[PDB]
Amino acid sequence: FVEPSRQFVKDSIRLVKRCTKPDRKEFQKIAMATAIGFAIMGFIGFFVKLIHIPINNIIVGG
Amino acid sequence: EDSPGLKVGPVPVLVMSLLFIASVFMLHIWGKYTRS
Amino acid sequence: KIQFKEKVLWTAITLFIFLVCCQIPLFGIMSSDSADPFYWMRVILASNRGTLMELGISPIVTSGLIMQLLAGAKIIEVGDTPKDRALFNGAQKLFGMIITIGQSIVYVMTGMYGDPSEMGAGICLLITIQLFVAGLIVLLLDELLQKGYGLGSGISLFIATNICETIVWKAFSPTTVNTGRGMEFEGAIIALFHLLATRTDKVRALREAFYRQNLPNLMNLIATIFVFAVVIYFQGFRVDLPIKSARYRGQYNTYPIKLFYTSNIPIILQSALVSNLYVISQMLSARFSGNLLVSLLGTWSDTSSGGPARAYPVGGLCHYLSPPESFGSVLEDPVHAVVYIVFMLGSCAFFSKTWIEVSGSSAKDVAKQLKEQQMVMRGHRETSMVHELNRYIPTAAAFGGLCIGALSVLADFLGAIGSGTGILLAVTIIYQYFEIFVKEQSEVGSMGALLF
């Protein structure tokens, strides 16, 4: 691991210098894309168990 | 490989899946279904 | 038949099968013991119960392992002639097929805990066979996919549900109170929307610190946002150069270079494989061949403490493997925390290059691509005469995964992720797949593709 260490330190300065951020506007864009994806999953969750669970015994109806 | 050639699908083919669903309800409650 | 149009339709069917697989165990329960280790079981398939996959995400690397280990040895080691399997897959089917049913059988065949009296007299033909059917269908599809495909996120979607479906499930299932939400000692109406309404009036009790410690999951969920920010940041980095395509002049068609982000994916695969270790170590000690005083000696730790008696190998083998999971930092015991950080850092780094490198990262691979579609060789060098894209791929790649594999391991000690290391890894999966998915569609958007 003391072998890869040497290589890594040279890289560590280099990447940050080479690459700019997600350029301000695109911080929102990446975050937003994830948010839509999360939302799809949430919809599924109500159908599977909100409806199904009060069938056995009424606790809110479904 | 396998001597059966049919891998893919495209309507009435997943017979194994169809059998699988039927068995479960027997085993226990969720709709107040009978327990085997 | 191949055709991108067909492929998208196939992906929709794959998603449907996963939903169906979840649906059947919800209606009935079997409940002769669950079996697979509880945290580990959740990482593969946190849903159903009874018929969670035993094949995806970690047996996958087993089959492929032979390539990694021998190559990384440098001299292949005193290993038996690897060869075998005639030549080409088919053996790939054989492995994952057995490993599904195999996991359920081994749990009572050997140690662990489940007193056998045979496999079952009755217990196995109902349980075991149902477990086998779900895993078998998914493997057959996966092998078929590995022959001329390279799209679809069936697999990714189950991980996506594991992060985000669970949040809503806990919210819309109680009647008791529940671990999730309220922070209320008893009954006091607990729903996510209901809590926000009451809280507005007076306080909220969550402008951070350590709160009361653990309590609801929701304290963690606020903290999540900070870990979210760093993972998205590392996506951004690229080194470009696809320039001068389809002419020369100036104008071109961009190729993204995945760079650091591709490198992390082997570590996520590695983390699951490492996790298993406790079951094998336990087997070597107690229940292997004759009671050697080296097999015993190496492992063990199972004499004392914590009240199990049987003692798993949660004494010491687990301690090296994983953190205590305590909320703050180094914690009460330095030793347990220190060893875990060291243990993962080396393993992560070695893995990060390797699967991705074989599957299509290197200048030799890229060389075959560039003849077909033409970058136009981008104002390069005659013969490439001290290679750009060749030299900078190993240096970038090794570092690339190092950051992510560092971060998840350290983050367990940090309060913010709810159940430590596994969640930080699991979130990272979601971004990369979503980004990839858009590229296959192309069709200038990012919008629908649900059945389109």
In a domain, C447, yes or no: no
CB C223 within 8 A of CB C416: yes
Contacts of C386 (CB under 8 A, 6+ apart): none
Tell the burial category of C113 from Cβ atoms under 10 Å away from its Cβ (0-12, 13-18, 19+): exposed
Q: Please state whether C205 falls in left (phi above 0), alpha (psi between -120 and 50) or beta.
A: left
- For the record, the structure tokens of C299 come out as 């492992």
DSSP C384: G
Which residue in this structure is represented by tokens 């059988």?
Answer: C105
- Chain A environment of C433 (Cβ under 8 Å): none
Question: B10 vs chain C: nearest CA distance in angstroms?
Answer: 9
Residue C170 is encoded by which pair of tokens?
């806990």
Tokens 């009424």 belong to residue: A58
Given an 8 Å threshold on Cβ–Cβ distance, is A45 in contact with C169?
yes
Q: Which residues of C are less than 8 Å from A53 in CB distance?
A: 173
Long-range contacts from C217-225, C-beta under 8 angstroms, 24+ separation:
C217/C167, C217/C170, C217/C179, C217/C180, C217/C181, C217/C418, C218/C180, C218/C181, C218/C192, C220/C415, C220/C416, C220/C417, C220/C418, C221/C167, C221/C418, C223/C415, C223/C416, C223/C417, C224/C416, C224/C417, C224/C418
Q: Which residue of B has its CA nearest to A49?
A: B30
Cα distance from B32 to chain A (closest Cα, Å)? 5
Answer for the pair C361, C262: CB distance below 8 angstroms, yes or no: yes
Distance (Å, whole) CA C210 – CA C199: 19
The helix/strand/coil state of C55 is strand
Q: CA nearest C158 in A: which residue? A: A41
C448 belongs to a structural domain: no
Chain B residues in contact with A50 (beta carbon < 8 A) = none
Characterize C261-272 residue by residue with b for buried, 16 or more Cβ atoms within 10 angstroms of its Cβ, and e for exposed.
Answer: bbbbbbbbbbbb
Is residue C100 within 8 Å of C56, Cβ to Cβ?
no
Beta strands in chain A (DSSP E): none
Backbone angles phi, psi at C426, to 5 degrees: -70, -40
CA neighbours within 13 Å on the CB side: how many for C80? 1
Query: C55 — phi, psi (to 5°)?
Result: 165, -70
Give the Cα separation of C409 and C51 in Å (integer): 30
Structural biology method used: cryo-EM
Neighbours of C153 (CB within 10 A): 19
**CB spacing of B2 vs C93 below 8 angstroms:** yes
CA–CA distance, C237 with C260 (Å, rounded to integer):
7
Q: What is the resolution of this structure in A?
A: 7.4
C-alpha span between C97 and C136 (Å, rounded):
6
> What is the distance in angstroms between the CA of the first residue and the CA of the last residue of chain B?
38
DSSP assignment string, B1-36: --S------SSS--HHHHHHHHHGGGT--SSSPPP-
Chain A residues touching C446 at Cβ < 8 A: 33
Question: For residue C23, what are its two tokens?
Answer: 């649906």
Cα–Cα distance between C348 and C353 in angstroms, integer? 9
Q: What is the DSSP letter of C430?
A: H
Q: Which two tokens stand for residue C157?
A: 């979607």
Q: What is the DSSP letter of C216?
A: S
Q: Could you tell me the residue range of the domain that residue C58 belongs to?
A: 4-439
Counting beta carbons within 10 angstroms of the beta carbon of residue C251, is it exposed (0 to 12), middle (13 to 18) or buried (19 or more)?
A: exposed
State whether residue A49 sits within 8 Å of chain B by CB.
no
- Which helix (H) or strand (E) segment holds residue C395: the answer is helix C388-411
DSSP string, C296-358: HHHS--TTS-SS-SS-TTTTTHHHHHS----SSSS-S-HHHHHHHHHHHHHHHHHHHHHHHHH
> Three-state SS for C439?
helix
Q: Find the closest chain B residue to A58 by CA distance.
A: B31
Task: Give the residue among C237, C175, C161 at the shortest CA–CA distance from C426.
Answer: C161
Smallest CA–CA distance from A54 into chain B, residue = B31
C52: amino acid identity, one letter? L
Question: Within 13 Å of residue C304, how many CA atoms lie on the same side as its CB?
Answer: 0
Name residues whose C-beta falls within 8 Å of residue C156's C-beta, 6 or more positions apart in sequence: C429, C430, C433
Residue C388 tokens, joined: 């750009």
In-domain check, residue C445:
no
CA torsion angle C289 C294 C295 C296 (round to 10): 100
- The alpha carbon of residue B20 is apart from the nearest alpha carbon of chain C, in Å, by 7
Measured CA to CA, the distance from residue A51 to residue A55 in angstroms comes to: 8
In a domain, C314, yes or no: yes
- Rounded to whole angstroms, the Cα distance separating B34 from B27 reads 7
C75 SS3 class: coil
Residue B25 CB: number of other CB atoms within 10 A? 16
In a domain, C449, yes or no: no
Q: Yes or no: say if C376 and C312 are a contact pair by the CB < 8 Å rule.
A: no
Q: Residues with Cβ < 8 Å from C376, sequence gap 6 or more?
A: C244, C245, C246, C247, C248
Assign residue C399 the CATH number of its domain: 1.10.3370.10
Q: How far is C415 from chain A (nearest CA, A)?
A: 22
The stretches of C84-153 forming alpha helices (DSSP H) are 91-109, 123-145
DSSP state of A54: G
Instruction: Specify the 3-state DSSP secondary structure of C438.
Output: helix
Domains: count for chain C: 1
Whether C134 sits inside 8 A of B16 (CB atoms) is no
> Which of chain B's residues have a Cβ under 8 Å away from the Cβ of A52?
30-31
Q: What angle do CA A27, A32, A33 make, to 5 degrees?
A: 105
CA distance C204 to C182: 10
Q: Is C47 helix (H, G, I), strand (E, B) or coil?
A: coil
User: Taking a C-beta distance cutoff of 8 angstroms, is the pair C337, C413 a contact?
Assistant: yes
Q: How many whole angstroms separate alpha carbon C339 and alpha carbon C323?
A: 9
Separation of alpha carbons C280 and C274, rounded Å: 11
Do residues C86 and C172 lie in contact, with contact meaning Cβ atoms separated by under 8 Å?
no
Contacts of C93 in chain B (CB under 8 A): 1-2
- Residue C55 β-bridge partners: C57
C189 closest CA partner among A60, A57, A42, A43: A60
Separation of alpha carbons B27 and C123, rounded Å: 12
Q: In chain B, which among 1-36 make CB contacts under 8 A with chain A?
A: 29-32
Residue among C256, C231, C260, C232 nearest C242 (CA): C256
Tokens read off for A18: 């080479």
End-to-end distance of chain C based on CA atoms, in angstroms? 18
Question: How many CB contacts within 8 angstroms connect chain A with chain C?
Answer: 90
User: Min CA distance, C292 vs chain A (Å)?
Assistant: 32
The count of CB pairs under 8 A between chains A and B is 9
Task: Count the Cβ atoms, other than its own, within 10 Å of residue A25.
Answer: 7
| H-assigned helices in C146-277 | 154-171, 192-201, 218-233, 260-276
Chains that touch A (3 or more CB pairs under 8 A): B, C
Q: Is A22 in contact with C234 (CB distance < 8 Å)? A: no
CA dihedral for C17, C23, C24, C30, sign (positive or negative): positive
Largest Cα–Cα separation, chain C: 77
Bridge partners of residue C189, in order along the sequence: none
C279 contact partners, CB below 8 Å, separation of at least 6: C37, C112
Name the 3-class secondary structure at C57.
strand
| C216, two tokens | 């609801």
Residue carrying structure tokens 């691991």: A1
HSE-up (13 A, CA, CB side) for residue C208: 9
Return the residue of A nearest to C236 by Cα.
Answer: A22
Cα C19 from Cα C27, distance rounded (Å): 13
Backbone angles phi and psi of C194, in degrees to 5: -65, -40
C217 vs chain B: nearest CA distance in angstroms?
26
**Burial of C23 per CB tally in 10 Å (0-12, 13-18, 19+):** middle
Residue C407 forms part of a structural domain: yes
Provide CB contacts within 8 A for C60, sequence distance 6+: C96, C269
Nearest chain A residue to B34 by CA: give it.
A56
Domain ranges of chain A: 1-60
For C36, C114, C119, C203, C309, the CA distances from C106, given in Å and listed in that order, are 10, 10, 9, 53, 22
